[PDB]
Amino acid sequence: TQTLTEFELKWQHWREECERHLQNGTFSSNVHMEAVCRVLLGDEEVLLEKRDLMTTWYHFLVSRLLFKHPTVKPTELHFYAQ
Amino acid sequence: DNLSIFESYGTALMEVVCRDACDGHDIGRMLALALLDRIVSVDRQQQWLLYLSNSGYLKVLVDSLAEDDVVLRNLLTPQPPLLKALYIYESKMAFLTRVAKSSQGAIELLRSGVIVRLAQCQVYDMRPAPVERYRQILLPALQICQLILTSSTAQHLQAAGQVLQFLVAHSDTIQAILRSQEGSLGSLQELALLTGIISKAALPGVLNELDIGLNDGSMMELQGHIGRFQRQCLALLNRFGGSDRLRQLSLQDDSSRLDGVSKKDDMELAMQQICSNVMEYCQALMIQNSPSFQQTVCLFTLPSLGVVIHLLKQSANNFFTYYDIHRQSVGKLQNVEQLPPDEIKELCQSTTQKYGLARRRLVKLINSRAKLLSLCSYIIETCLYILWRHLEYYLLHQDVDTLLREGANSFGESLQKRLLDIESLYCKVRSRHSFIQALVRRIRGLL
């Protein structure tokens, strides 16, 4: 029953929690946990460093949509795909 | 017997008619929806309603509402291509409104996510004939919501949560409507229903359990909406509780027919409703919240607190105004009642249907008057309870000036006959001795 706007607000709040943990240096002793936390923030540099796990540009697209644009509209997909 | 015949055919006739009502074409859809609206109204057994739900036709009809966003955008134009879509929408909303009147129907609509789908519609944010049309859209949507939930069961309280989500999702438009200085009865009805929904949905208990997944923020949003409701509610006292009352009632006198009379009646309705609900809300907040009883901070010398004194002065002034009007309305109702079958014969000397309509008008009068009655009973009660505990607290903890003003107004409360006809219709006098005890605590406190 959740609206896309209620989802977007929970998603933004969760993203701010991820960002706060990164800024506090919570993961500074483990590069892999820090990299996973940067992936959760949709960090494009770290997503591209992990290209070999995705193998295709369309897997990379869907991971970008998951961590930056979870409420994406059909009409906007082409722009993100290109 | 008719229902037995509808059943007798089997879920076959019901399926064909309900499917065709959904997605046929224009006229046929409109008529099929109207037919469904009418059949579901005489559905004491509510079998048709069960079939519609189990066969998925009710869901399809609800999903099809998202279709009209584009239609509304095209319609806001000066020239309309076809009013056919408006009539389908009306038949559809009428049918849904009929289904929502049912205690179960309201639950089934909530399961089907009707409020969630209305919250996704952007047409409600396009406030501009075009303005009248935005008005009508608002009408149907909000209609269904409020009526449903209200006539809804106590167990389905989330109804209030979902409706509040709808009000918050369109906060700009809602605030614009609450700031509109409009003497039209419609605006008052909108305000009355909205204040009713806010009074039931905006319980600080809904914001604390809403932190499970939305969390620290959903509470602030909740507190924010509530604070706005509070300010807008208090602003209504200057509009309806000040020298502007006479101007709102005089601009409609350029033309007062029976229509205008009833309009003023329900203007009073609103005045009443919009706030009984708000007062209820205040009382509920005080009984659960208990007016920050735990806090030891002085209530009397960001917000302000003279605001309370103002509110007290205003509510004390409004009480006498409301009481005078309530008393005047009762006399008019008694005069309407006096008119007999003999009055129709005198008019004839159709006179009979004139009296049919006359009775219509007078019973509408009765409605409005009794509404006002309950409203003011409640008003009085609230003022009292509040002021009572208020002054209780104040006691220990300016006091002389307040006491002097209070004694003067309290004497002047004359009427100072509290009446007993609404009370003679209602049950026991909680205006009498409960109010008398409040007076002993307060008038004596003023002394």
Place this chain on the structure above:
Amino acid sequence: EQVKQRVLHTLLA
């Protein structure tokens, strides 16, 4: 119904 509930609460008080 709301008015009746308020009256019942007042009676309980």
Place this chain on the structure above:
Amino acid sequence: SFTEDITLSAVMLQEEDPGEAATMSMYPDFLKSFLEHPSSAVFELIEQYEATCNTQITLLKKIVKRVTPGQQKFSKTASILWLLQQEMVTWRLIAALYRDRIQSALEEENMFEIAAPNASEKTIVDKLFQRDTLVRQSQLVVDWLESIAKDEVGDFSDNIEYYAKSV
């Protein structure tokens, strides 16, 4: 139990008169209660008829209280509520008088002492407690009528205490 109560209340809301159907549904329960237990202890049966009436009276009182004053539609339901209250109190009356008349018939067996040395009231009444077949019964009618008035809480009482605190 909460699901069955909601379904029955929702089914009765589909009937053209929920009051008349609530009276009709009790007819088999009254016959069953009359049959069930033995003739020797019918009383427990009458106490169960009173309890069945009181259950429906409590439901109808909740319905009538929720109705806005002025709907002519509930005048028949209010009359049936009063008649069911009259039925309930008639069962209570039957239980009181037939227990007591039956008690005298099967229990005034023991006796016997004429007058007392004391002029004390208690001793006079203890001696004459057996001996009146009219009096005892008149006090049972008083106790019965006092029990009805006890059930009848007019209840502004606590708010009446609020109305005038000891002060």
